């Protein structure tokens, strides 16, 4: 991850 | 022990990055970490939104490691300078990113160094100003490497992935397939330039000064290309952006991704490349890339246009339409430079222009055109491409077109150039013909029974149909 | 001819802050005066503004904290090319 596919695909 | 990603980018034959600096725009970093300590200079430039200690510098420490870490880095030497544009939750702003890119240009003007690689492991939506800033910083002689984005979407809808004159990297996994996780995964499309390892990438962990962690992302993938670029620019300091991008493409593993992971309309647009360091071997050679235009849109007089870099030559030009409602393509002069222009047909959803751009110095290149009559033109040096465009709604070194169309020959005075034509016909949805090893596909087209388009994929000419004959022009020194 | 742009992904938009981008050949001295003019005209209308940064080196222009009500006024300023509403970028 919230809120942009952040940190290894959430 | 060698991590899978560093083995993956190793060439099939092998044996840096210190006259180059790699700027990193990311979270804060744990510069004490033994992977990167003494290698990364925190500028302490900071411009971040407010949040809404080792979590803080986790992202950027990992990526600083992937580029330059001594145990697990791609360019194990590599001076880095880090700016902080992402807060402790990983959030930044366009405006802050702008100021950091501006900060890099001021530093370069104040204290000139050598080649500069700026890593942008971040994404937000399509931004005019961020794309403008990235392009103008590229035109000032700086290489930008950016992540495609992790949304399993068209990278052209994201910035700075969609940015012109920037190297946009998608992520592949240990099976060489595009990263997918749930509805997320690597972006794709014609704004992606190549792919690099980006799943399960071991690098420095900010939990402790000697710790390591695995992370995935298109940031990790771009970190690979940024270290790859830093080593290329160490070996060949004088490379222009077109010459470095032609080498990244040339040295990539090819046709190794299973295009079925991509949405149907994006398989033709997404390059099938996985980045790799260049081998021990490297004499001059002929590099070409395929450059797809943005879709023209549906207006009845729409034209897509595909352009080469200023120091490339446009050796051929084709067009593609998914429905097949198109009026062909022509080469035109703009600024004394040839571009590739495709025409939409009345009633079609749009077309793509597909340029074939090549580093061919000492080349004087001209177009020979014949109006409708079957139609024929020829050169009178060497034929590199055939093009055709018509005005109607329906139906050696020579080009041949439909009786009702114009045809166009790309003719190049290039001594030291040798070209040959190779044809393949079948009774069929897709017909294919490839150049032999050592030759470069310069021109691809279909003999004039209803064609969706033709385009060069690497050195294979691909013709798409709703007897069909693919025609490949192949050159070498 | 000056145009306004904001992020097409609504949850990534950051209203209240705007990147005023000026025409390519615009000199830093002009950027500073165009920002000062905006502040002036906005104050005559009752709006506090804040010039957070003036750009020069890649793009000329400036970064302003102001109500969006002023976009029509700000678009008519001399040397303006386009204005973009700030938005989020994210670690990938």
Coordinates of C-alpha atoms in Angstrom, one line a residue:
Chain A
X1 CA 2.5 -2.9 -0.8
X2 CA 0.0 0.0 0.0
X3 CA -0.6 2.1 -1.9
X4 CA 1.7 1.5 -5.0
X5 CA 3.1 -2.2 -5.5
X6 CA 5.8 -1.2 -3.1
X7 CA 8.4 -3.5 -1.2
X8 CA 8.7 -6.7 -3.3
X9 CA 5.1 -6.5 -4.6
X10 CA 3.6 -5.9 -1.1
Chain B
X1 CA 27.4 -19.2 -3.6
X2 CA 27.3 -16.7 -6.6
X3 CA 23.7 -15.4 -6.4
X4 CA 21.5 -16.4 -9.3
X5 CA 21.1 -12.9 -10.6
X6 CA 24.8 -12.1 -10.9
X7 CA 25.4 -15.5 -12.7
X8 CA 22.4 -14.7 -14.9
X9 CA 23.9 -11.4 -16.2
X10 CA 27.3 -13.0 -16.7
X11 CA 28.2 -13.4 -20.4
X12 CA 28.9 -16.9 -21.9
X13 CA 32.6 -15.9 -22.0
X14 CA 34.2 -13.6 -19.4
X15 CA 37.2 -12.5 -17.3
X16 CA 34.7 -2.3 -12.5
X17 CA 32.8 1.0 -12.9
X18 CA 35.1 3.5 -11.2
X19 CA 35.5 6.5 -13.7
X20 CA 31.7 6.5 -13.5
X21 CA 29.5 7.8 -10.7
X22 CA 26.1 6.3 -10.0
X23 CA 23.6 8.6 -8.4
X24 CA 20.8 7.0 -6.4
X25 CA 17.5 8.7 -5.7
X26 CA 15.8 6.6 -3.1
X27 CA 15.2 6.3 0.7
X28 CA 17.9 7.1 3.1
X29 CA 20.8 4.6 3.2
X30 CA 22.9 2.9 5.9
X31 CA 26.2 4.1 4.4
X32 CA 28.0 2.3 7.3
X33 CA 27.0 -1.1 5.8
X34 CA 30.0 -3.2 5.0
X35 CA 28.7 -3.9 1.4
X36 CA 28.9 -0.2 0.5
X37 CA 30.8 1.6 3.2
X38 CA 33.5 3.8 1.6
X39 CA 31.7 3.4 -1.8
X40 CA 28.5 5.5 -1.3
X41 CA 28.6 9.3 -0.6
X42 CA 25.4 10.5 1.1
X43 CA 24.9 13.9 -0.4
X44 CA 22.3 14.6 2.3
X45 CA 20.1 16.1 -0.3
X46 CA 16.7 15.5 1.2
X47 CA 13.2 16.3 -0.1
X48 CA 10.5 14.0 1.1
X49 CA 6.9 14.3 2.2
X50 CA 6.1 13.7 5.9
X51 CA 5.1 10.2 7.0
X52 CA 1.4 9.4 7.4
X53 CA 14.9 3.5 11.8
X54 CA 16.1 0.4 9.9
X55 CA 12.8 0.3 8.1
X56 CA 13.7 3.8 6.9
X57 CA 16.8 3.0 4.9
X58 CA 15.9 -0.6 4.0
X59 CA 15.0 0.1 0.3
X60 CA 17.9 2.3 -0.6
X61 CA 20.5 0.2 1.2
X62 CA 19.5 -2.8 -0.7
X63 CA 19.7 -1.0 -4.1
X64 CA 23.0 0.7 -3.2
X65 CA 24.2 -2.9 -2.6
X66 CA 22.8 -4.3 -5.8
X67 CA 24.7 -1.7 -7.8
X68 CA 28.0 -1.6 -5.9
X69 CA 28.2 -4.0 -2.9
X70 CA 31.5 -5.8 -2.5
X71 CA 30.0 -9.3 -2.1
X72 CA 26.7 -9.1 -4.0
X73 CA 27.0 -6.1 -6.3
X74 CA 27.0 -5.8 -10.1
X75 CA 29.6 -3.1 -10.4
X76 CA 31.6 -4.0 -7.3
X77 CA 33.9 -0.9 -7.5
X78 CA 31.5 1.9 -8.5
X79 CA 31.4 5.2 -6.7
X80 CA 27.8 6.1 -5.7
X81 CA 26.2 9.3 -4.5
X82 CA 22.8 9.0 -2.9
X83 CA 20.0 11.5 -2.6
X84 CA 16.9 11.0 -0.4
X85 CA 13.6 11.6 -2.3
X86 CA 11.6 8.9 -0.5
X87 CA 10.5 9.1 3.1
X88 CA 10.5 6.2 5.7
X89 CA 7.3 4.7 4.1
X90 CA 8.8 4.9 0.6
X91 CA 6.7 7.8 -0.6
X92 CA 8.1 10.7 -2.5
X93 CA 6.7 13.5 -4.7
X94 CA 7.3 14.5 -8.3
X95 CA 8.4 18.0 -7.2
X96 CA 11.0 16.5 -4.8
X97 CA 12.3 14.2 -7.5
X98 CA 12.5 17.2 -9.8
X99 CA 14.7 19.0 -7.2
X100 CA 17.0 16.1 -6.9
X101 CA 17.5 15.7 -10.6
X102 CA 18.1 19.4 -10.6
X103 CA 20.6 18.9 -7.7
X104 CA 22.6 16.4 -9.8
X105 CA 22.8 18.8 -12.7
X106 CA 24.1 21.6 -10.4
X107 CA 26.7 19.3 -8.9
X108 CA 27.9 18.3 -12.4
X109 CA 28.2 21.9 -13.5
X110 CA 30.1 22.9 -10.3
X111 CA 32.4 19.9 -10.1
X112 CA 32.6 18.1 -13.5
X113 CA 33.4 14.4 -13.3
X114 CA 33.1 11.7 -16.0
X115 CA 30.1 9.7 -17.2
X116 CA 27.0 9.9 -14.9
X117 CA 24.4 7.2 -14.3
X118 CA 21.3 8.3 -12.4
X119 CA 19.2 5.4 -10.9
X120 CA 15.5 6.1 -10.4
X121 CA 14.0 3.1 -8.7
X122 CA 10.6 4.7 -8.2
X123 CA 7.3 5.3 -10.0
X124 CA 4.2 7.3 -9.9
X125 CA 1.6 8.0 -12.6
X126 CA 2.4 9.6 -16.0
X127 CA 3.9 13.0 -15.4
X128 CA 4.6 15.6 -18.1
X129 CA 7.1 17.5 -15.9
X130 CA 9.0 14.5 -14.6
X131 CA 9.3 13.1 -18.1
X132 CA 10.4 16.5 -19.3
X133 CA 13.0 16.8 -16.6
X134 CA 14.4 13.3 -17.3
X135 CA 14.7 13.9 -21.0
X136 CA 16.4 17.3 -20.6
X137 CA 18.8 15.8 -18.1
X138 CA 19.5 13.0 -20.6
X139 CA 20.1 15.6 -23.4
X140 CA 22.7 17.2 -21.0
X141 CA 24.7 13.9 -21.3
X142 CA 23.5 11.9 -18.3
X143 CA 22.3 8.3 -18.4
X144 CA 19.1 7.6 -16.5
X145 CA 18.0 4.1 -15.4
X146 CA 14.5 3.7 -14.2
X147 CA 12.2 1.0 -13.0
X148 CA 9.3 0.0 -15.1
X149 CA 6.9 -0.2 -12.2
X150 CA 5.4 -3.1 -10.3
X151 CA 1.7 -2.9 -11.3
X152 CA 1.6 -5.5 -14.1
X153 CA 0.5 -2.8 -16.5
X154 CA 1.6 -0.7 -19.4
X155 CA 4.8 1.1 -18.3
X156 CA 3.9 4.0 -20.6
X157 CA 1.3 5.0 -18.0
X158 CA 4.0 5.6 -15.4
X159 CA 6.8 8.1 -14.8
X160 CA 9.6 8.2 -15.1
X161 CA 9.2 4.8 -16.9
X162 CA 7.5 6.5 -19.9
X163 CA 10.2 9.2 -19.9
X164 CA 11.8 9.7 -23.3
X165 CA 15.6 9.1 -23.6
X166 CA 15.7 7.0 -20.4
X167 CA 16.4 3.3 -19.9
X168 CA 13.4 1.6 -18.3
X169 CA 13.9 -1.9 -16.8
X170 CA 11.3 -4.6 -16.1
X171 CA 11.9 -7.5 -13.8
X172 CA 12.3 -11.2 -14.6
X173 CA 12.7 -14.1 -12.2
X174 CA 15.1 -17.0 -12.0
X175 CA 13.2 -18.9 -14.7
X176 CA 13.7 -15.8 -17.0
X177 CA 10.0 -15.1 -16.8
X178 CA 8.4 -11.8 -15.9
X179 CA 7.7 -11.4 -12.2
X180 CA 4.1 -11.9 -11.3
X181 CA 2.7 -12.0 -7.8
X182 CA -1.0 -11.8 -7.5
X183 CA -2.3 -9.0 -9.7
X184 CA 1.1 -7.3 -9.3
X185 CA 4.3 -7.9 -11.1
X186 CA 6.6 -6.3 -13.7
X187 CA 5.2 -3.6 -16.0
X188 CA 5.6 -4.2 -19.8
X189 CA 5.1 -2.6 -23.1
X190 CA 7.0 -0.5 -25.6
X191 CA 8.3 1.8 -22.9
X192 CA 10.3 -1.0 -21.3
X193 CA 13.7 -1.3 -22.8
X194 CA 14.9 -4.6 -21.4
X195 CA 14.5 -6.8 -18.4
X196 CA 16.9 -7.8 -15.7
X197 CA 16.8 -10.0 -12.6
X198 CA 14.3 -8.6 -10.1
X199 CA 13.0 -11.5 -7.9
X200 CA 14.8 -12.8 -4.9
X201 CA 17.8 -10.5 -5.2
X202 CA 20.2 -10.7 -2.3
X203 CA 21.7 -7.4 -1.2
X204 CA 22.7 -5.4 1.9
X205 CA 20.1 -5.3 4.7
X206 CA 19.9 -2.3 7.0
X207 CA 18.9 -4.5 9.9
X208 CA 22.6 -4.7 10.8
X209 CA 25.9 -3.7 9.3
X210 CA 26.8 -7.1 7.9
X211 CA 23.3 -8.5 7.4
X212 CA 21.7 -9.5 4.0
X213 CA 18.1 -9.8 2.7
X214 CA 16.2 -10.8 -0.4
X215 CA 14.0 -8.3 -2.2
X216 CA 12.2 -8.3 -5.5
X217 CA 11.1 -5.4 -7.7
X218 CA 11.7 -3.5 -10.8
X219 CA 13.9 -1.3 -8.7
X220 CA 16.2 -4.3 -8.2
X221 CA 16.1 -5.0 -11.9
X222 CA 17.0 -1.4 -12.7
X223 CA 19.8 -1.5 -10.2
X224 CA 21.2 -4.4 -12.3
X225 CA 21.1 -2.4 -15.5
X226 CA 22.6 0.7 -13.8
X227 CA 25.6 -1.3 -12.6
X228 CA 25.8 -2.9 -16.1
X229 CA 25.8 0.5 -17.7
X230 CA 28.4 1.8 -15.2
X231 CA 30.8 -0.9 -16.3
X232 CA 30.1 -0.4 -20.0
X233 CA 30.8 3.3 -19.5
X234 CA 34.0 2.5 -17.7
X235 CA 35.2 0.4 -20.6
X236 CA 34.0 2.9 -23.3
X237 CA 33.7 6.3 -21.6
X238 CA 32.8 8.0 -24.9
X239 CA 29.5 6.1 -25.5
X240 CA 26.5 8.2 -26.4
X241 CA 23.1 7.2 -25.1
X242 CA 22.1 5.5 -28.4
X243 CA 25.5 3.6 -28.5
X244 CA 25.0 2.4 -24.9
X245 CA 21.4 1.4 -25.5
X246 CA 22.4 -0.5 -28.7
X247 CA 24.9 -2.5 -26.6
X248 CA 22.5 -3.2 -23.8
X249 CA 20.2 -4.6 -26.4
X250 CA 22.9 -6.5 -28.3
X251 CA 24.4 -8.1 -25.2
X252 CA 21.0 -9.2 -23.7
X253 CA 19.8 -12.8 -23.8
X254 CA 17.2 -13.0 -26.5
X255 CA 13.8 -14.7 -26.9
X256 CA 14.1 -16.1 -23.4
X257 CA 10.9 -14.7 -22.0
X258 CA 7.6 -16.6 -22.7
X259 CA 5.5 -13.8 -24.2
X260 CA 2.3 -15.5 -22.9
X261 CA 2.8 -13.8 -19.5
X262 CA 2.0 -10.5 -21.2
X263 CA -1.5 -9.3 -22.3
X264 CA -2.1 -10.2 -25.9
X265 CA -1.8 -6.6 -27.3
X266 CA 1.4 -6.1 -25.4
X267 CA 3.4 -9.2 -26.6
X268 CA 4.4 -7.4 -29.9
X269 CA 5.4 -4.2 -28.0
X270 CA 7.4 -5.7 -25.2
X271 CA 11.1 -6.4 -25.9
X272 CA 12.2 -10.0 -25.2
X273 CA 15.6 -9.1 -23.6
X274 CA 17.2 -10.0 -20.4
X275 CA 20.2 -7.8 -19.6
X276 CA 23.8 -9.1 -19.5
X277 CA 27.3 -7.9 -19.1
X278 CA 29.3 -7.9 -22.4
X279 CA 31.7 -10.8 -23.0
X280 CA 35.5 -10.9 -23.1
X281 CA 35.6 -10.6 -26.9
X282 CA 34.0 -7.1 -27.0
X283 CA 36.4 -4.5 -34.8
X284 CA 33.4 -2.6 -36.0
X285 CA 29.9 -4.2 -36.3
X286 CA 26.4 -3.2 -37.3
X287 CA 24.0 -2.6 -34.4
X288 CA 20.3 -2.0 -35.1
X289 CA 17.3 -1.7 -32.8
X290 CA 13.5 -1.7 -33.4
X291 CA 11.7 1.5 -32.3
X292 CA 7.9 1.3 -31.9
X293 CA 5.9 4.5 -32.1
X294 CA 3.0 5.4 -29.8
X295 CA -0.3 4.2 -31.3
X296 CA -1.6 6.8 -33.7
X297 CA -5.2 6.9 -32.3
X298 CA -8.3 6.5 -34.5
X299 CA -8.6 9.8 -36.2
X300 CA -8.9 9.2 -40.0
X301 CA -5.8 11.3 -40.8
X302 CA -3.8 10.0 -37.9
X303 CA -0.1 9.3 -38.3
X304 CA 2.2 7.5 -35.9
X305 CA 5.8 8.6 -36.1
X306 CA 8.9 6.6 -35.0
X307 CA 12.3 8.5 -34.6
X308 CA 15.9 7.4 -34.2
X309 CA 18.4 9.0 -32.1
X310 CA 20.4 11.8 -33.7
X311 CA 23.5 9.6 -34.2
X312 CA 21.5 6.7 -35.6
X313 CA 20.3 6.1 -39.2
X314 CA 16.8 5.1 -40.1
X315 CA 17.5 2.0 -42.2
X316 CA 13.9 0.8 -42.6
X317 CA 10.3 1.6 -41.7
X318 CA 7.2 -0.6 -41.3
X319 CA 3.8 -0.4 -39.7
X320 CA 1.4 -2.6 -37.8
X321 CA -2.3 -2.5 -37.0
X322 CA -4.2 -5.1 -35.0
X323 CA -7.3 -5.0 -37.1
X324 CA -5.4 -4.5 -40.4
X325 CA -7.1 -1.2 -41.3
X326 CA -4.0 0.8 -42.3
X327 CA -2.6 2.8 -45.2
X328 CA 1.1 1.6 -45.0
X329 CA 4.1 3.6 -44.1
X330 CA 6.6 6.1 -45.6
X331 CA 9.9 7.6 -44.7
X332 CA 10.0 11.4 -44.5
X333 CA 12.6 14.1 -43.8
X334 CA 12.3 16.2 -40.7
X335 CA 15.2 18.4 -39.6
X336 CA 17.4 16.8 -42.4
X337 CA 16.8 13.5 -40.6
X338 CA 14.6 10.6 -41.7
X339 CA 11.7 9.4 -39.6
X340 CA 9.2 6.6 -40.0
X341 CA 5.5 7.6 -40.5
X342 CA 2.6 5.2 -40.6
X343 CA -0.9 6.0 -41.8
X344 CA -4.2 5.0 -40.3
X345 CA -7.0 4.0 -42.6
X346 CA -10.4 5.6 -42.4
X347 CA -12.3 3.4 -39.9
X348 CA -9.3 1.8 -38.1
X349 CA -8.4 2.0 -34.4
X350 CA -4.9 3.3 -35.2
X351 CA -1.6 2.1 -36.4
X352 CA 2.0 1.8 -35.1
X353 CA 5.1 3.1 -36.9
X354 CA 8.1 0.7 -36.5
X355 CA 11.5 2.2 -37.2
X356 CA 14.7 0.2 -37.6
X357 CA 17.5 2.4 -36.2
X358 CA 21.1 1.5 -36.7
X359 CA 24.5 2.9 -35.8
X360 CA 25.9 3.2 -39.3
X361 CA 28.5 6.0 -39.4
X362 CA 29.9 7.2 -42.7
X363 CA 26.5 6.6 -44.2
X364 CA 24.8 8.8 -46.7
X365 CA 21.2 7.5 -46.9
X366 CA 18.4 8.6 -49.2
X367 CA 14.9 7.6 -50.2
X368 CA 13.8 6.5 -53.7
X369 CA 10.0 6.9 -54.2
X370 CA 7.6 5.7 -57.0
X371 CA 3.9 6.6 -57.2
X372 CA 1.1 4.1 -57.9
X373 CA 1.2 2.5 -61.3
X374 CA 2.9 -3.4 -59.9
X375 CA 4.9 -0.5 -58.5
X376 CA 8.8 -0.7 -58.4
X377 CA 11.8 1.4 -57.3
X378 CA 15.5 0.6 -56.8
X379 CA 18.8 2.1 -55.8
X380 CA 21.5 3.4 -58.2
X381 CA 24.3 1.7 -53.8
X382 CA 22.7 -0.8 -51.3
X383 CA 19.0 -1.3 -50.4
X384 CA 18.3 -1.4 -46.7
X385 CA 14.5 -1.0 -46.5
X386 CA 11.2 -1.2 -48.4
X387 CA 8.2 0.9 -47.5
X388 CA 4.8 1.4 -49.0
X389 CA 1.8 3.7 -48.5
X390 CA -1.5 4.1 -50.3
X391 CA -4.4 6.6 -50.5
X392 CA -7.2 4.1 -51.1
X393 CA -9.4 2.1 -48.7
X394 CA -8.7 -1.5 -50.1
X395 CA -7.0 -3.4 -52.8
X396 CA 18.5 -6.0 -57.9
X397 CA 18.2 -3.8 -54.8
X398 CA 14.5 -3.3 -55.7
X399 CA 11.2 -2.7 -53.9
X400 CA 7.8 -3.9 -55.2
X401 CA 4.4 -2.7 -54.0
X402 CA 0.7 -3.1 -54.7
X403 CA -0.2 -1.4 -58.0
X404 CA -2.2 1.2 -56.2
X405 CA 0.4 2.2 -53.6
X406 CA 3.6 4.3 -53.5
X407 CA 6.8 2.5 -52.7
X408 CA 9.9 3.8 -51.1
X409 CA 13.5 2.4 -51.0
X410 CA 15.9 3.2 -48.3
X411 CA 19.2 3.4 -50.2
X412 CA 22.5 3.8 -48.4
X413 CA 25.9 4.7 -49.7
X414 CA 27.8 2.6 -47.1
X415 CA 31.2 1.2 -48.2
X416 CA 32.1 -1.8 -46.1
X417 CA 28.4 -2.7 -46.0
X418 CA 27.2 -6.0 -47.5
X419 CA 23.4 -6.8 -47.7
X420 CA 21.4 -9.8 -48.8
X421 CA 17.7 -10.5 -49.1
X422 CA 16.1 -13.7 -47.6
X423 CA 12.5 -14.7 -48.3
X424 CA 10.1 -17.2 -46.8
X425 CA 6.6 -17.9 -48.0
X426 CA 3.9 -20.3 -46.7
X427 CA 0.3 -21.2 -47.7
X428 CA -1.3 -19.0 -42.1
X429 CA -1.4 -16.5 -39.3
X430 CA 2.3 -15.5 -38.9
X431 CA 5.2 -16.0 -41.3
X432 CA 8.8 -15.7 -40.2
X433 CA 12.3 -15.3 -41.8
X434 CA 15.6 -14.6 -39.9
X435 CA 19.0 -13.4 -40.8
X436 CA 22.0 -15.8 -40.4
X437 CA 24.3 -15.4 -37.4
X438 CA 26.6 -12.5 -37.8
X439 CA 24.2 -10.5 -40.0
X440 CA 21.9 -7.7 -38.9
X441 CA 18.2 -7.4 -39.9
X442 CA 17.9 -3.9 -41.3
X443 CA 14.6 -4.1 -43.2
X444 CA 11.5 -6.2 -42.9
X445 CA 8.4 -6.3 -45.1
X446 CA 5.8 -8.5 -46.7
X447 CA 5.4 -9.2 -50.4
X448 CA 2.1 -7.8 -51.8
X449 CA -3.1 -12.1 -48.8
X450 CA -4.2 -9.5 -46.2
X451 CA -1.4 -8.3 -43.9
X452 CA -1.7 -6.9 -40.4
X453 CA 1.8 -5.5 -40.6
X454 CA 5.4 -6.5 -40.4
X455 CA 8.1 -5.7 -37.8
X456 CA 11.7 -6.7 -36.9
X457 CA 12.0 -8.7 -33.7
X458 CA 15.8 -8.9 -33.1
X459 CA 17.1 -10.3 -36.4
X460 CA 13.8 -12.1 -37.3
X461 CA 11.4 -10.5 -39.8
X462 CA 7.8 -11.2 -38.7
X463 CA 4.9 -10.7 -41.0
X464 CA 1.3 -10.9 -39.5
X465 CA -1.7 -11.9 -41.6
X466 CA -5.4 -12.1 -41.0
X467 CA 0.6 -17.3 -50.2
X468 CA 2.2 -14.8 -47.7
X469 CA 5.9 -14.0 -48.1
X470 CA 8.2 -12.5 -45.5
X471 CA 11.2 -10.5 -46.8
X472 CA 14.2 -9.8 -44.7
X473 CA 17.1 -7.5 -45.6
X474 CA 20.3 -8.5 -43.8
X475 CA 23.5 -6.6 -43.7
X476 CA 27.0 -6.8 -42.2
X477 CA 30.5 -5.4 -42.6
Chain C
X1 CA -1.9 28.1 -25.0
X2 CA -0.8 27.2 -21.5
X3 CA -2.2 23.9 -20.2
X4 CA -2.9 22.2 -16.8
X5 CA -2.1 18.6 -15.9
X6 CA -2.8 16.4 -12.9
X7 CA -2.1 12.8 -12.1
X8 CA -4.7 10.5 -13.8
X9 CA -4.5 8.2 -10.7
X10 CA -6.7 10.0 -8.3
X11 CA -5.2 8.5 -5.0
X12 CA -1.7 9.7 -6.0
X13 CA -2.6 13.4 -6.5
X14 CA -1.3 16.0 -4.1
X15 CA -3.5 19.0 -4.3
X16 CA -2.3 22.3 -3.0
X17 CA 1.1 22.3 -4.6
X18 CA 1.8 23.0 -8.3
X19 CA 4.8 22.9 -10.5
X20 CA 4.7 26.0 -12.8
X21 CA 6.8 25.2 -15.8
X22 CA 8.0 28.0 -18.0
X23 CA 9.0 28.1 -21.7
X24 CA 12.4 26.5 -22.5
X25 CA 14.5 29.7 -23.0
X26 CA 13.2 31.5 -19.8
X27 CA 15.9 33.0 -17.7
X28 CA 16.1 32.5 -13.9
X29 CA 15.5 36.2 -13.3
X30 CA 12.2 35.9 -15.2
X31 CA 11.2 32.8 -13.2
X32 CA 11.7 34.7 -10.0
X33 CA 9.6 37.7 -11.2
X34 CA 6.9 35.5 -12.5
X35 CA 6.7 33.7 -9.2
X36 CA 6.6 37.1 -7.4
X37 CA 3.9 38.3 -9.7
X38 CA 1.8 35.2 -9.0
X39 CA 2.2 35.8 -5.2
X40 CA 1.2 39.4 -5.8
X41 CA -1.9 38.8 -7.9
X42 CA -3.0 36.0 -5.6
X43 CA -2.6 38.3 -2.5
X44 CA -4.7 41.0 -4.2
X45 CA -7.4 38.3 -4.4
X46 CA -7.0 37.2 -0.7
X47 CA -4.8 34.1 -1.2
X48 CA -1.6 33.4 0.7
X49 CA 0.9 31.5 -1.5
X50 CA 4.3 30.1 -0.8
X51 CA 7.1 29.8 -3.4
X52 CA 8.7 26.6 -2.2
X53 CA 11.5 26.5 -4.8
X54 CA 12.6 28.1 -8.1
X55 CA 13.8 25.7 -10.8
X56 CA 16.7 26.4 -13.1
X57 CA 19.2 24.0 -14.8
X58 CA 16.8 21.5 -16.4
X59 CA 13.4 23.2 -16.5
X60 CA 12.7 26.9 -15.7
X61 CA 9.8 27.5 -13.5
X62 CA 8.9 27.2 -9.9
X63 CA 7.0 25.2 -7.2
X64 CA 4.1 27.0 -5.5
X65 CA 1.9 26.2 -2.6
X66 CA -1.5 27.7 -3.4
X67 CA -5.2 27.0 -3.7
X68 CA -6.2 25.5 -7.1
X69 CA -8.6 28.5 -7.5
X70 CA -5.6 30.4 -8.9
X71 CA -4.9 28.1 -11.8
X72 CA -6.8 30.3 -14.3
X73 CA -4.8 33.3 -13.1
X74 CA -1.5 31.4 -13.0
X75 CA -2.0 30.0 -16.5
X76 CA -2.1 33.6 -17.9
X77 CA 1.3 34.5 -16.4
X78 CA 4.1 35.5 -18.8
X79 CA 6.3 32.8 -20.0
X80 CA 4.1 29.9 -18.8
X81 CA 4.2 26.6 -20.7
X82 CA 2.1 24.4 -18.5
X83 CA 1.3 23.8 -14.8
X84 CA 1.2 20.3 -13.2
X85 CA -0.3 19.4 -9.9
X86 CA 2.2 17.6 -7.6
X87 CA 1.8 13.9 -7.1
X88 CA 3.3 10.9 -5.4
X89 CA 6.2 8.7 -6.5
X90 CA 6.9 5.4 -4.8
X91 CA 9.7 3.0 -4.1
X92 CA 9.4 0.1 -6.6

